[PDB]
Subunit: 268 residues, 2 copies
């Protein structure tokens, strides 16, 4: 059951995240962080826990990694919603951090949520120091100027430009903006097991692009719908989900929960 | 001698930082990062390099930590310079990042500079994985909601609070905002050698306070202690900084000179 499993992960992450932030000193900065990290479908946390499971690793052992990726995701949104960025008053129908506190508080809460993500990677519950440093390196690659921040920067620049982006450009944007962090989550189980990262990386590359394509289809400047056509976007998204499922053939029947997740990304 | 030791550290950090940022994809973002991390006196880089030397660790083996604290410090500047924060138009004679690019590019460059500091901490040259993960935790403890960001958030509240803060309060405030990152840099050497961090921590505590106090000679320490009562205090704390390193004996001479120099 993907839905039940998804629900179990959401509930476990919500409780754990609350606690993690709770031990920080009191104040507007902690409340803002706590608020930003509350809720969400928890896709990334799910991929970390699920990919750990495939390598026989418990949720309790995997949790700090799940927390770190949700923390990193949360901070990215806190900043992206800001006026000079995407300028969103609402996130899932509730006021954004910068609206509920101010712009200064949103800068600071996202800054500390990124710091929190990295701190979480150091928790010895995760396992050997060797796997933990590989975890930090992988998070940093995905989140920084080669991954997440780079694709945000491409996307901010795209929002202005009076020449729409090409397919090759929007693919590069999406690989960093969205693709990179999902790939971190998917590989996190392999990192913690000291195992081949290959299949989960390939899975994630396909899943990440299906994810963004699906977003665009529901969303009705170049998009996957404007570039590929509506039926063309839908067909691409389904072909990438099949590519993602095929990437997990090494794992046999144990890949079925991850195969279902890829299908879920586009089944809306 | 300390003067030439610092300049040889400044040139070596400048090249190493340029190369580290240079390996990133091109664009405004990498342009902004390079500009933000360029120049400065490198006190924190110097601390990391000299704390490693005290434990018999080469500059090259300590460089990624010297780079990480400088990367972390530069990011904090880029954000703090912004209109919703300190709202500075110039830094070191030149337009700040949000002026030269825009507010959005400042957000993102600072964001990626923090991520780069954490990447730097995973570099195999630093030594064992256990020591690198210890370096990572210490960096996050120092930089986040328990540390630097915590102190910056307290600072923003201060200037809109009902009445001025007291002595104790501005001390706790600066211990986070200024002291925590300097303590990381001073401890890096001990962290990388897997040795007692005690003396370096106590060195940094005193030095960080004196740094801020000398950096007030342009409310503040001078408002509550006076023109001269702030000088003597900073001089006292330099003395305490030096004494914290007594267990190292005379091998402490470069760090001790570094502390005496922050007050001129």
């Amino acid at each position: 059951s993907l839905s039940e499993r998804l629900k179990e992960v959401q509930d476990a992450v919500e409780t754990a995240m609350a606690a993690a932030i709770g031990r920080l000193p009191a104040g507007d900065l902690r409340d803002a962080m706590a608020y930003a990290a509350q809720g969400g479908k928890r896709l990334r946390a799910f991929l970390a826990i699920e990919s750990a499971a495939i390598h026989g690793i418990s949720m309790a052992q995997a949790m700090p990694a799940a927390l770190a990726v949700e923390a990193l995701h949360a901070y990215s949104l806190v900043h992206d919603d800001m006026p000079c960025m995407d300028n969103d008053d609402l996130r899932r129908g509730l006021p954004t951090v910068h609206k509920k506190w101010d712009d200064a508080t949103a800068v600071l809460a996202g800054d500390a949520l990124q710091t929190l993500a990295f701190e979480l990677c150091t928790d010895p519950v995760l396992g050997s120091a060797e796997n933990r440093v590989a975890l930090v390196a992988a998070l940093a690659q995905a989140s920084g100027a080669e991954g997440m921040v780079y694709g945000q920067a491409l996307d901010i620049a795209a929002e202005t430009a009076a020449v729409p982006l090409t397919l090759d450009e929007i693919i590069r944007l999406q690989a960093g903006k969205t693709g990179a962090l999902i790939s971190f989550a998917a590989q996190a189980g392999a990192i913690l097991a000291g195992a081949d990262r290959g299949p989960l990386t390939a899975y994630a590359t396909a899943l990440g692009l299906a994810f963004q394509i699906a977003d665009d289809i529901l969303d009705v400047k170049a998009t996957f719908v404007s570039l590929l056509g509506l039926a063309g976007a839908k067909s691409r998204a389904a072909d990438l989900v099949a590519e993602a499922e095929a990437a997990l053939a090494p794992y046999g029947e144990a890949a079925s929960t991850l195969r279902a997740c890829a299908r879920y990304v586009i089944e809306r």
